[PDB]
Design a protein around this ligand. Sequence first.
Ligand code: LOP
Ligand code: LOP
Ligand code: HEC
Ligand code: HEM
Ligand code: HEM
Ligand code: HEM
Ligand code: HEM
Ligand code: LMT
Ligand code: LMT
Ligand code: A1IKG
Ligand code: A1IKG
Ligand code: FES
Lengths: 240, 54, 53, 378, 378, 74, 56, 110, 39
Amino acid sequence: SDLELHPPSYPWSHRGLLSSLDHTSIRRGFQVYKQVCSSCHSMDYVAYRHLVGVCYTEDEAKALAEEVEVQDGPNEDGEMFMRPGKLSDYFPKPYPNPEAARAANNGALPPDLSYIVRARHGGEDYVFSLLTGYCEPPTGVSLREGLYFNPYFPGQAIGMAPPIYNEVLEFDDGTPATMSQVAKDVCTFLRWAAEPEHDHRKRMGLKMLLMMGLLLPLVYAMKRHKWSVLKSRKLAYRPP
Amino acid sequence: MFMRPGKLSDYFPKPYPNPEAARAANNGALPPDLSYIVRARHGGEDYVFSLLTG
Amino acid sequence: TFLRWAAEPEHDHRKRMGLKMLLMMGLLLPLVYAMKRHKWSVLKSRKLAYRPP
Amino acid sequence: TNIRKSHPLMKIVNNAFIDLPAPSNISSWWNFGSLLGICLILQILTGLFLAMHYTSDTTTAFSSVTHICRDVNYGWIIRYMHANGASMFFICLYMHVGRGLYYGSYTFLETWNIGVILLLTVMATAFMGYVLPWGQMSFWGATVITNLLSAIPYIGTNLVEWIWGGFSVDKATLTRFFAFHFILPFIIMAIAMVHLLFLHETGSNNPTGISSDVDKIPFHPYYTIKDILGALLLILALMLLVLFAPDLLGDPDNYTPANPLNTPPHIKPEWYFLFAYAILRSIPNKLGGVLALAFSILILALIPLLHTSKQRSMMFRPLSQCLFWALVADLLTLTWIGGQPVEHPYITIGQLASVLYFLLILVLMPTAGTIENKLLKW
Amino acid sequence: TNIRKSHPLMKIVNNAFIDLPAPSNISSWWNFGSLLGICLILQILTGLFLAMHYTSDTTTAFSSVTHICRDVNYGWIIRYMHANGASMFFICLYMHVGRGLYYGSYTFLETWNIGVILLLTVMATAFMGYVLPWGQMSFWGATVITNLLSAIPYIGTNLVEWIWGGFSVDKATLTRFFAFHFILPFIIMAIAMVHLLFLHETGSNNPTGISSDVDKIPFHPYYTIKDILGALLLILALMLLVLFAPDLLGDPDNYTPANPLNTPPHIKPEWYFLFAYAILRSIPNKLGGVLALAFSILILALIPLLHTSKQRSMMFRPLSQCLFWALVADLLTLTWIGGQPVEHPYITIGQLASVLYFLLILVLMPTAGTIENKLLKW
Amino acid sequence: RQFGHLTRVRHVITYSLSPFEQRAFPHYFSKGIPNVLRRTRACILRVAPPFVAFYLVYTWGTQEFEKSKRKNPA
Amino acid sequence: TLTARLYSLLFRRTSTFALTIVVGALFFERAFDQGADAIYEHINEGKLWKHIKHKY
Amino acid sequence: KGFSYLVTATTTVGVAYAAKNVVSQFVSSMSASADVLAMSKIEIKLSDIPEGKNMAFKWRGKPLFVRHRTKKEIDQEAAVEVSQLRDPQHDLERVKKPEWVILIGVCTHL
Amino acid sequence: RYRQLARNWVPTASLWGAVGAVGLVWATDDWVPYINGKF
Ligand SMILES: CCCCCCCC/C=C/CCCCCCCC(=O)O[C@H](COC(=O)CCCCCCCCCCC)COP(=O)(O)OCCN
Ligand SMILES: CCCCCCCC/C=C/CCCCCCCC(=O)O[C@H](COC(=O)CCCCCCCCCCC)COP(=O)(O)OCCN
Ligand code: HEC
Ligand code: HEM
Ligand code: HEM
Ligand code: HEM
Ligand code: HEM
Ligand SMILES: CCCCCCCCCCCCO[C@@H]1O[C@H](CO)[C@@H](O[C@H]2O[C@H](CO)[C@@H](O)[C@H](O)[C@H]2O)[C@H](O)[C@H]1O
Ligand SMILES: CCCCCCCCCCCCO[C@@H]1O[C@H](CO)[C@@H](O[C@H]2O[C@H](CO)[C@@H](O)[C@H](O)[C@H]2O)[C@H](O)[C@H]1O
Ligand SMILES: CC1=NC2=C(COCC2)C(=O)[C@@H]1c1ccc(Oc2ccc(OC(F)(F)F)cc2)cc1
Ligand SMILES: CC1=NC2=C(COCC2)C(=O)[C@@H]1c1ccc(Oc2ccc(OC(F)(F)F)cc2)cc1
Ligand code: FES
């Protein structure tokens, strides 16, 4: 409690200044959210459309949308119905409110995952080392039950059961579904979910650095030119 | 969700849960909300009075 | 009557203020008007004389 | 020596409003400038208060306004003030422009064109403000009017959709109109600063139209008292509306929330745009109607070049005076027509009024200037 | 003759920014004034764009901002710019104030006190802007800070509740903070106009501290080029953050919606207020801490009277230079402390840093001025 | 330009009186009513004619709208 | 010198100096975009959707 | 002169590029958001509507009618009165398929 | 005579008209090769 273990720094394929997200890794990581996390955890800020051009073709995304049941607004009778999802629907809330979520999780509310990378210090490093960090308590530690030991969490007692282990799911691409591999992929997706802009921003960064490489010596040269009149000048005092 | 008795703090209740429900119940016509009705019809009280008695 | 009140709860307060506004303006309009005339009296009264040699 | 004359900030205020040589003989018609300033301050204050309570989401917006009127302390008086305020502003504006035309104040070109821009800018402001409550008129008004820019060939459709930020006037349009409506009065204040800056180069015109340097008087106290008197009268008027007749100048459909499925029986904008609505409605063709609507306003900018009289002011110009009042009455008629449904006889009254309007400004009053000149042997 | 010198509007711009006699020798430290202007324009533009998309209802607000970042075209870059923009503004502000202190620019009293007000006004602005997203920090930050006004005896409780418009920071507070945050930059622009107006009475100081009338140079083109160069460097910096490190200067708790039931582990305001947070936190007593926080800022206003040196600028004042940099480092320390939880050793580091701060301004640097005077036989 | 070099005036005498020496409303009705009549007679034939015509075009056209909305026997 | 050729051809007349700059910005925009883009997309080989999209 | 003005000309080009970018970005910010484009278009399955029967849908928040038309409807709407209509428009140019008429389900009147 | 014996702004306003044409076409974004000719 009130101790440390701050995450180490894993060499993500997107750590580098000009390095984009691995989009194949995002695709796998989505799968990890879909099959594992989405039972407990919402992600209210992603819609099926957002996967298009990122990790899924347009109709692939449509397939994924059609797979879910969503409520739709009042019909003729003034009744609510269910339908298949479209691209336009946001990824569905696993419970109809937070209190319902709590009842289902021994009184703990699972955070929405939209921003989770962004709203926890350490981001991907934190979350990765969380999922892969579960260990048996040290000698002398006894946790209230249904709260698990994890050295990377504040206080070390987390109300989340270790959600991740080998072959916990099947990969579209068929990548070896080892525990560490699935924690990487889900983290990659969780970064993208928190910051869709990651790649565009990094592209612009490059173009900004380039333009500034041009413009900074250029304007600096303009400055020196004008000021050369003054820099060169020699003064002479000549009283009679 | 539960039901309870109203308090002072509750707004006067909607007779149906949406407009489409209201329509079904009124041969396809939607009864206007009455909050502003005096204000949102030319003639105000004179209009509405002569409507009800007309 | 209820439908008027529902549309405009303020009906009575507004009408009270109307009265107080009319009253204050009854005071203030001739008052300030009098102030105006006073200052301007210098100018209103003045007589002009052209007197070339 | 004396602070009012030296201190960098006080100097300006002194030069502007205390020791400014004003003509002896400016009439009540010169009150309007100060009054417009008041209008502007009034809107900003009442506006600011409203904006502490209002929301610009389609779903919350109509009710947030009524919430001001029911549950916010004195929210009602503030709201009705800002609304009647907008009317008082346009009255002041049209009176002010009237004086410009009749007394030949428009000879002050820079002052004048700034003024035209002030007018346009206040117009934009009030157009977008009227949308903010999200009533039936607000919505259908804003839809029809913005759609006119669709008649622009090549780019019309794209341009209107970019303003909207979608395929109709919807969530994105309201939120941006809130933004624009907030910042525009600020820009109006600066333009008005400049408006004055140029006026202060020439000093004021007067009703004779004849130079008044031989009979100027210090602004304070003559015109300080007189502006105050005028402001009282403006307040008398404003509050008469707010406290006795708050809805007199508005449309009731604006108490019925905006509904994209049910179009109101007669769609009109606010009264202060009715003359221009009626000109627009007179033209069969839609781009024609647009260009007429624009010209009904922008023509203001041309009036300086259309001046023929050897005398500046209409005081001594009987024929011109008659024509001036003709134009005024015609604008009353254009307003009547613009509030009317498109049926006989109004279609034809409107067409005539529209012809008369442009005819007066571009042909009749120029001519009259000249006839008068000949009557005077120059 | 020449338009730039005559025309009422151009004259001002000429006098202000083209033909203004500037000292030959002003350093990079005089860049900050222009840069602050840029900061201000930058915030207004990016701000205006954001405001076309944002809503100030507790329920919609957090998501409307994220909507800008997900679904509005380029909304992300705009938003991050306005946020890093706010940091760049405070950097420019603290650099600018630094130069004031070191070079004795504060002898220009009117200019200087206006400046203090600019600082306060920008502070208010950024405080209220940070609330607008309605994150965990936004909310709990705004709560703690506004609550300090509760420590005002007699009226404290009432006063804080009136600001809020209720019994906690809630719906009414956010909507009004949106309003205030919008109009304040406008008022900052005017105050800044005035800030310059007074500066233009004296012209600029320079690093020697010695009058420079014998060696002035026309502003354009020497300082036009040089300000541009500076603005590039500001842009380089701003965009480095936005495009490489957009979250570097912020707190992650501000990605977690505001929740009145769960208080964050460490509550801090933005970094640009940390020195003052740490001074406040040093005092046991709550009204004590308030008055210290206020004094840590308002003391700026007194520094003119605390000047002892016979020389204006610190250029030739070694002892004073050391003390100046001591103050700077101390403020770095106060910032560190203010970002830290209230535990050993930080409680005591903070207390010391707080003492050191006031000690330097009110006793040490006055003294040093005087010691230096004696070292020079005056 | 400010008071001091506005223009050049020669040979003109201005006599006036303190406000505190004088009535605010000298002969307000006895001079003022006649003056107002004089003022109105002067302008009404320029100003009133248009508004008469407005009232008429509005009277007529309002009632032409009335008539056309009725039925006629045919 | 090259610069001499440029001065007399493009830069002496201010109308021409402007025409130069608009036209050159045109070709610079296209060139710089295309080149920097290729620089980024080689630095990030394999990782972009546009690199993997052939699979779906 | 050439050299020193080259620097100037170069400089301006770079700034123009950057400025173009800054500006046009701000501009697209005002054009419809991705979420408003996601409601741009609506897909309808034609094999899921029967012959003669109307089927309503929701479009830009408004009713949107598609109708499968019989050869009765097609021929009876083919040779109606060319000119005499209130709003003169023939049928082979209100539609793109003879047997499919698509219409927004809002009365033009009120 | 002497205005008309101006008309020396005709070749300069020719070059300013190309600046206006090419400028509006750059700011707004086929038959110019390379630039946009290859989208
Ligand atoms: C896009 C903008 C379009 C163009 C703008 C049109 C402006 C709209 C008009 C508003 C009224 C403007 C007032 C004009 C200046 C007044 C001139 C005036 O007072 O003339 C009077 C007669 O007064 C009188 O008889 C005064 C009676 C005032 C009449 C009320 C006006 C009706 C409002 C109509 C609203 C649509 C004679 O005065 P002078 O020649 O100065 O002589 C004084 C005595 N020697
Ligand atoms: C409520 C407000 C509170 C009070 C305000 C405090 C201000 C915060 C401080 C920011 C930095 C201000 C800069 C002060 C003026 C700079 C003076 C200066 O450049 O001095 C240099 C040494 O420079 C150098 O060595 C330049 C190095 C610059 C150091 C970076 C500063 C660190 C930032 C800390 C942030 C919290 C010597 O220059 P001169 O005496 O002019 O002599 C020149 C050569 N003859
Ligand atoms: C229900 C059995 C869960 C499944 C399946 C997953 N998670 Fe979870 N998670 C759950 C609860 C009840 C909580 C709250 C924990 C607490 O101590 O109160 C959580 C929390 C997280 C966190 C937050 C860590 C922090 O610092 O707060 C993360 C990053 C998280 N969960 C991630 C996650 C991922 C990636 C999952 C699928 C791979 C996943 N969770 C499944 C309950 C449940
Ligand atoms: C020229 C100045 C202004 C004019 C002409 C003006 C005009 C209008 C108009 C016509 C309305 C519709 C009023 C109604 O019928 O409900 C309105 C509403 C509003 N205005 Fe303004 N306004 C101005 C300045 C401002 C300013 C500066 C603000 C805020 C900073 C503001 C905030 C509002 C708000 C919140 C509403 C919605 C509430 C309401 O409808 O009353 N206004 N404005
Ligand atoms: C916000 C709107 C406006 C404000 C605040 C404003 C303000 C003022 C002020 C204070 C004056 C001097 C006082 C006066 O002579 O009445 C004035 C004069 C003037 N204004 Fe305006 N004005 C506005 C709009 C306009 C418009 C729309 C026009 C013309 C289309 C205009 C043209 C003039 C002219 C010509 C004068 C000089 C009058 C004279 O000296 O005879 N103004 N204005
Ligand atoms: C001194 C000038 C200004 C400063 C220092 C400033 C500062 C801030 C700050 C610190 C935030 C929080 C940013 C964040 O972390 O999300 C913010 C948000 C915001 N500001 Fe400003 N602002 C300024 C001017 C303006 C203006 C003039 C407007 C609008 C007219 C505006 C509109 C907004 C809006 C809508 C937000 C919410 C969106 C967001 O959080 O990014 N700002 N401002
Ligand atoms: C929005 C914030 C501000 C803006 C836009 C601003 C603007 C400017 C500008 C343009 C200059 C002239 C250029 C320069 O010498 O750097 C200047 C100078 C000055 N400002 Fe500020 N300023 C601001 C805040 C402040 C503050 C907070 C202070 C003091 C607390 C201050 C005190 C001064 C002083 C003393 C000078 C004269 C410097 C000299 O000539 O040596 N200003 N300001
Ligand atoms: C005076 C002749 C005797 C027989 C008719 C007696 C009725 C009174 C005279 C008016 C007759 C109505 O006939 C006419 O109808 C049209 C259609 O609405 C209207 O007139 C208008 O028509 C269209 C309206 O879209 C416009 O293009 C046209 O420019 C305009 O004149 C007038 O109302 C009237 O000119
Ligand atoms: C040096 C003596 C040998 C024995 C102690 C060795 C430990 C190192 C020295 C510091 C001892 C800690 O004891 C002390 O604890 C308090 C409580 O948090 C902190 O000190 C603080 O106490 C409260 C905090 O609310 C403040 O009112 C007080 O002004 C301040 O000094 C310091 O951390 C430390 O002065
Ligand atoms: C200067 C001026 N010259 C003349 C006349 C009359 O003719 C002669 C010249 C005037 O009537 C006036 C005038 C103008 C405004 C005013 O009161 C204000 C001030 C400021 C204000 O807010 C604002 F935003 F505009 F700044 C609102 C009202 C008082 C007097
Ligand atoms: C006047 C001035 N005197 C001096 C120095 C340097 O010391 C000598 C005196 C300056 O650097 C400057 C200066 C100040 C601002 C500026 O660029 C602007 C202008 C306007 C602007 O928007 C605003 F809202 F403020 F109006 C934003 C930036 C350029 C130059
Ligand atoms: S006939 Fe359909 S709304 Fe009038």
